């Protein structure tokens, strides 16, 4: 019901690769961003684009592909080469269909995790499994940006954590039937799956370069909420008369991070409001899921009420798995953002969320 595949999880299973003949002009630009950004012929091709109606995007996978197409074009139109020459107005020809499509899918008109990671992938050979070697991305921004490395390693973590999500029904079924051994194995499988997701995340070092990420890709994943370059926001010509502020990319847009926090009862001020705001950037069905988990019986309260050492240890195994992921996430933010920048605000938020996870330990 909440669009969560057993294998792929929150990611879009088998994303669509081609749009109908009607949107060939949109597809041409998005597929040639590395060439158009470098030559500078991008903004002219976006400005000389005719206004296409979103009526031919009938199914969810085509609507999601068109959002990925328009989203990547919008970030390339706004940032350009990334040397201060920025655009504060998105042309009517592209801003009104992108906002109509974003309204239909209940997502903000900005490139989001659901678009550039969850719907931006394919299998090279459909016979082989979901491994980096047998996978590729549909869209990139520049040659050498490490977008194949960044988006695929992010996606591989989502697929690794999807194994823990399919265990969630078993957790609540065991609490209803008072099956201690069934509940204990379920909590251990969630912990084992979250530990395996950390090992998958180690592959970032193999396929992403810190200099290329910080000074090339990171520009195209940046938004216009609190950014001094677009202090007031971006004007979506034809749709809104005032500039609108929408946030850029962040690990908080992944529903997997917030999924196990809500499952384990891990509930301050500036950090709490930011994570609640990040749900607006997730697909509507995934927010309805994160919220249905909140209204399910508390796993934390049940384990504490039983006064069982085994269940308390198995609960702390899942908590320690989340702190290990957030600690290693901070280590990667140091390598890919702090070190290249000095050649900070994000770290404080991550340190705060990690301390709240550590405080949720029972032992």
What residues line the site for a second copy (CB under 8 A)?
A: 176-178, 240-242, 267, 272-273, 276-277, 279-280, 287-288, 291-292, 294-298, 301
Strands 235-236 and 89-90: parallel
Q: Which is nearer to ligand Y9X, 239 or 336 (CB)?
A: 336
Query: Interface with ligand Y9X includes 11 (CB under 6 A)?
Result: no
Query: Interface with ligand Y9X includes 4 (CB under 6 A)?
Result: no
Cβ 113 to ligand Y9X, closest distance in Å?
Answer: 4
Between the alpha carbon of residue 71 and those of residues 17, 108, 171, 231, 244, the distances in Å are 15, 10, 38, 20, 15
Footprint of ligand Y9X on 112-131 (CB under 6 A): 112-113, 116-117
Q: Which is nearer to ligand Y9X, 159 or 303 (CB)?
A: 159
Query: Interface with ligand Y9X includes 156 (CB under 6 A)?
Result: no
Q: Which is nearer to a second copy, 25 or 179 (CB)?
A: 179
Among 152, 251, 264, 278, binds ligand Y9X (CB under 6 A): 251
CA gap 126, 148 in Å, rounded: 18
Among 63, 93, 120, 253, binds ligand Y9X (CB under 6 A): 253
Report whether 158 contacts 254 (CB < 8 A): yes
CA gap 261, 269 in Å, rounded: 16
Query: Interface with ligand Y9X includes 158 (CB under 6 A)?
Result: yes
Q: Which are the contacts of 236, defined by CB distance < 8 A and separation ≥ 6?
A: 90, 95, 96, 98, 99, 109, 244
> Partners of 122 in the beta sheet?
136
Strands 122-123 and 135-136: antiparallel
Query: Interface with ligand Y9X includes 336 (CB under 6 A)?
Result: yes
- The owner of tokens 């719907």 is 119
Given ligand Y9X, a second copy, none, residue 176, with its beta carbon under 5 to 8 Å by kind, binds: a second copy
CA gap 133, 262 in Å, rounded: 33
286 is in an annotated binding site: no
Given a second copy, ligand Y9X, none, residue 273, with its beta carbon under 5 to 8 Å by kind, binds: a second copy
Q: Nearest-CA neighbor of 77 among 66, 65, 90, 67? A: 90
CA-CA-CA-CA torsion sign (341, 158, 138, 41): negative
- Which residues lie near ligand Y9X (CB under 6 A)? 111-113, 116-117, 154, 157-158, 201, 221, 249-251, 253-254, 256-257, 325, 329, 332-333, 336-337, 346
């Amino acid at each position: 019901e909440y669009h969560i595949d057993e294998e792929v999880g929150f990611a879009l299973p088998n994303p669509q690769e081609n749009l109908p003949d009607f949107y060939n002009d949109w597809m041409f630009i998005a597929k040639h961003l590395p060439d158009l950004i470098e030559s500078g012929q991008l903004r002219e091709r976006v400005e000389k684009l005719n206004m296409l109606s979103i009526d031919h995007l009938t199914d969810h996978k085509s609507q999601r592909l068109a959002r990925l197409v328009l989203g990547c074009i919008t970030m390339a139109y706004v940032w350009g080469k990334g040397h201060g020459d920025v655009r504060k107005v998105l042309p009517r020809n592209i801003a009104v269909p992108y906002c109509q499509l974003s309204k239909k899918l209940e997502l903000p008109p900005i490139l989001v995790y659901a678009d550039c990671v969850l719907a931006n992938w394919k299998k090279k050979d459909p016979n082989k499994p979901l491994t980096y070697e047998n996978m590729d991305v549909l869209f990139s921004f520049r040659d050498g940006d490490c977008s194949k490395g960044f988006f695929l390693v992010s996606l591989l973590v989502e697929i690794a954590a999807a194994s823990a999500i399919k265990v969630i029904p078993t957790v609540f079924k065991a609490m209803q039937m008072q099956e201690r051994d069934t509940l204990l194995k379920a909590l251990l499988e969630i912990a084992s799956c979250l530990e395996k997701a950390l090992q998958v995340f180690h592959q970032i070092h193999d396929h992403v370069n810190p200099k290329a990420f910080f000074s090339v890709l990171r520009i195209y994943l940046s938004g216009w909420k609190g950014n001094p370059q677009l202090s007031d926001g971006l004007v979506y010509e034809g749709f809104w008369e005032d500039p609108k502020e929408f946030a850029g990319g962040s690990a908080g847009q992944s529903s997997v991070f917030q999924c196990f926090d809500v499952l384990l009862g891990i509930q301050g001020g500036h950090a709490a409001q930011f994570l609640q705001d990040m749900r607006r950037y997730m697909p509507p069905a995934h927010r309805n899921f994160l919220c249905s988990l909140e209204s399910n019986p508390s796993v934390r309260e049940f384990v504490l009420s039983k006064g069982d050492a085994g269940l308390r240890e198995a609960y702390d195994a899942c908590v320690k798995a989340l702190v290990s992921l957030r600690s290693y996430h901070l280590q990667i933010v140091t390598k890919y953002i702090l070190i290249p920048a000095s050649q900070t605000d994000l770290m404080n938020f991550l340190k705060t969320v990690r301390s709240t996870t550590e405080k949720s330990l029972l032992k």
